[PDB]
């Protein structure tokens, strides 16, 4: 955990929050996971090459 007594731990907290912004910025760009299933709901596959 970051030290709140010193500027170096305030920098560790800032760096930790900027890290979590980047993970959300990547999940903003990630496509949904698409899956196709048959009439009894058996999985056929994951779809990735769609237009």
């Amino acid at each position: 955990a970051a030290d709140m007594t010193t500027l170096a731990g305030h920098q560790q907290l800032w760096d930790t929050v900027m890290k979590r912004r980047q993970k959300r910025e990547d999940e903003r760009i990630a496509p949904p996971l698409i899956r196709l299933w048959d009439g009894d709901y058996k999985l056929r596959g994951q779809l990735v090459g769609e237009r």
């Binding site: 048959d38 009439g39 009894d40 709901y41």
Partner: protein, 54 residues
């Protein structure tokens, strides 16, 4: 009692389980929709056709 007796009918079908269908490649085999399908649909009654033949 008015419209209580013989006032409705349900007619079933082999669609879920298996049929041969007049589509190229489905004429000789048996295929069904699957265990997951839409259940009921209402037959429109405004001309009373069900009272001549349901």
């Amino acid at each position: 009692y008015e419209n209580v007796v013989l006032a409705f009918m349900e007619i079933p079908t082999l669609r879920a389980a298996g049929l041969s269908l007049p589509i190229a490649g489905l004429e000789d085999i048996v295929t069904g929709l699957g265990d997951f399908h839409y259940n009921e649909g209402w037959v429109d009654g405004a001309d009373k056709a069900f009272t001549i033949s349901a």
